Amino acid sequence: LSMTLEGIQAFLAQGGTIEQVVTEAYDRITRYGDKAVWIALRPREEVLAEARALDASPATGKPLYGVPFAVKDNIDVAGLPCSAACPAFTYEPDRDATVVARLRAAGAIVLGKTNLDQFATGLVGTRSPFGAPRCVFDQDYISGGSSSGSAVAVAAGLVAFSLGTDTAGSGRVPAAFNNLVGVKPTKGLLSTSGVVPACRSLDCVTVFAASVAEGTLIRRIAEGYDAADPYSRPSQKRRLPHVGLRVGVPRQDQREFYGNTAYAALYQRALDEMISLDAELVEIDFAPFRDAAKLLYGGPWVAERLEAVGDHLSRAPDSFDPVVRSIVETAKTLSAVDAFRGQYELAALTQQANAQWARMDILLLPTAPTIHKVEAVMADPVRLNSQLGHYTNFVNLLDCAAIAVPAGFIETGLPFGVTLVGPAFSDDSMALIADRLHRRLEPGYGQDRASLPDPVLEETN
Template sequence: MADKHFPRALSIRWLRDAYLKHEVSPEDTVREIVNRAEADAGMNIWITPPRMERIRPYLDRLASLDPAGAPLWGIPFAMKDNIDWAGVPTTAGCPDFQYVPTEHAAVVARLIAAGAIPVGKTNMDQFATGLVGTRSPYGETHNALRGDLISGGSSSGSAVAVARGHAAFALGTDTAGSGRVPAALNGLVGFKPSLGAWPTKGVVHACASLDCVTVFTHDLADALEVDRAARGIDDFDPWSKSFLPPTAAIPAKLCLPKEQLHFFGPYAKEYGRAWQTAVERLNRLDIEIEYVDIRLFSQAASLLYGGPFVEERWAGLGGFIDAHPGSALPVTEQILRSGAAEQYDAASLFKAMHTLQMLKLESGKLLKDAVLVLPTAGGTWSRDQVRANPVQTNNEMGRYTNHCNLLDLCAVAVPSDAAAIGLPFGITLFALAENEGLLCGAAKAFLGDPGVHATAVSRPNTLVAVCGLHMRGYPLEKQMRACGARFVREDRTAAKYRMVRLPTTPSKPGLVKRPQGGSAIGLEVWEMPMEAFGLFVASIPAPLCIGKVELRDGTEIPGFVCEDYAAAEAEDITAFGGWRTAK
């Protein structure tokens, strides 16, 4: 594998191109994923981790598939462990609940038929009863960027698997936000189709009438590729509905909250500023903005866990909990047993249903030809804080998500400008079930997709030359991603530079321009939003700093350089031509 270079962020587009050029094979990809999963074992991403012997039949099967007719040929994916993979245990995050299904979940079968390769089953909040990613007997799933912070739940492992490059995409489920919150906390796209658009047959339900299978990816295009393979009615799924794949279109308006939003947690101020930055970006789009009263969405959200709808969870899992005392985590059992509370009866359920129907009517009028935009999450927490206060911290994570499925909305969570280094921030766009195309069009406009017919004023960016640990595949690439930076190209400096190995732990390169002589040094060029650039520069430790780097074509761009005093006594590694080839 030494001669195979994989980017940290695996994407459908990159893999497809690499396969076409015979630069890597699907087997190379799986071996890289197995190595990455083993290296990240302490992050508790997997319940059933990637193993070559388990994946081998799906690799061998590719020889019988025509890549031209298999749109996901050779694309590795992960699935949350409440989604069935034939012959592999499904635990739903509870060892005593475990069973081995004899057939794939409907959506998994469709993806495999399209050529995708299942690689493993991911960790989750037990029985999908959380938005924090810490409620699992298989360990707390660490955030992909900062291990002290929560990863988001309940589809925690699926999101982190994609963010850490263990899969090109991963399936989650979403009842109250589980397909969106982990996306925001790990810098990803989380696509939640309309209820029933993807079949849920073969899924361990949290609330069968509200559950959706969702997907995590690095960009919206990949999410929609998966959608095309997964979507469609299933004749054996009572919750399945017929929805055509969305065609991106621009909504008549974007609805933003007129009231001041609540932000929480240790980074509440940073989240508040990031939301204002996102609003400024939205206002630069050529789409009408209307500021609306969002209390109706809060009312709907309160019905999900503050009313008789919680009984649906107990209806599905109460029998297991009663028959297996002590099998569930205490916090999980507490949540499930709330559905058996004496104050809930048939009359209270019907009253809640009638209230919800009125709220659906109001939201339908408000969002006709429109898209609602909210923060995906109003903050985050450290894992220690969640342990100390598991219920309240979890409740806060659902503040801007819980209304979605009750009101029969589709949604997509997309990254916005980072709140701080290593602290992603994202927004969620919501639309009526029949308006998935407006959802996708608005998301593409916000992300700057040139294929959408909307005038988006580009946010100012700067190129940055990166020559060391911030390059793709190295430990500090995550800092670039957290700042909203994107890889542009590989390049070389003008033949005027010396590279040294600094005596740090881990060792880092230092790039020094010489008045005469010197060599051309390999590097990467990235593009970073100017809003994040200042904070990024301020975080760089001496003796490294940002200066002007002259490229081989004579242009100068900001990039990593080293102060002369530190380079004087450091080991000269110029002859290697770059950090990737330095020994």
């Protein structure tokens, strides 16, 4: 059994059952040796019962017929608790989050709730009372976060896809550290109703998948206007060129890796391989994107998180992970004046970014500048985390779409990923470009660099 959309469809087609798919997933879950992946797992027998019921129904109109998935524990799934990795926060949602409801109606099956950095605050994966999920290539290394368990579960073949959320960059960072495709839809496309807020105005539901095509199908299914969510936006499609594509990259002197020379080398290598794609590389000034990024935690947007968990925080700050607690407690000193100043700075930076967008169709970045051992992060938990947001943190502030794809491996055996960044609503066009890049650079996914499921994406157009 290949745990991908294609693998499962194929296994079912050749006489296999959903019940067997679930059995195998559970077998894999039981043998996987990372104690931090899951916060709350369904009992196998109840999932088997759901498997059977579905087995006995038509596959018609269910594009995700019998497909197991994991859901990050800041996203509501009826019948399981939801905690945002904060035991004191724990509640029992009556209803599936909207995106979950849509995926399940397409026939997908929830296996359990995956671990995360608490209140989706962190890019490391280590800020959880449940322990730190680990890089699937080396247990000494961070899985990345905050969608830590979701990425690990897919890369380890436990489920075919997973949901996370992305605010600072969590749709992308743990995809890179675990050799996955991370689809980060334009904000507002997928409902955040039934999702615990982090930065409410910025939060996106995000997809971890084995390929761009599979991630894209999952995204489209989950996508849809939802008036319950104040930030929901109806879909638009903005097209990007294919013939004549211009790919922006930062200036040489803007390529920061915080000492990681292997990562620097692999980024350059990606650029080297790209001359055989039908694309032109354009050096752009990355500064306005870089400075916009800093506003997320270095500016007043952190106050959004304080809004989200402020009741629990004042009630009992000791209930909080100590690093997250400290970050959100500091936000308390920001005024409305600070918030508007941040907005003014963002508006100006947006002007400057727009001038750079005039030069390129899409931006190509290291997903992260480096990767860290868990032990290194525990010793230096704020600073080393912030490094990981160097290239990610402007994306939702500047209303962009993004896709993280595998770009290769350094010699010590750790993955290196890159991220494509495009303007709002360019999600479909980006999917095509990303698929092409992925299949050019590092055409496999997950812990075994496994064969990518078909189909490859083709020009519509």
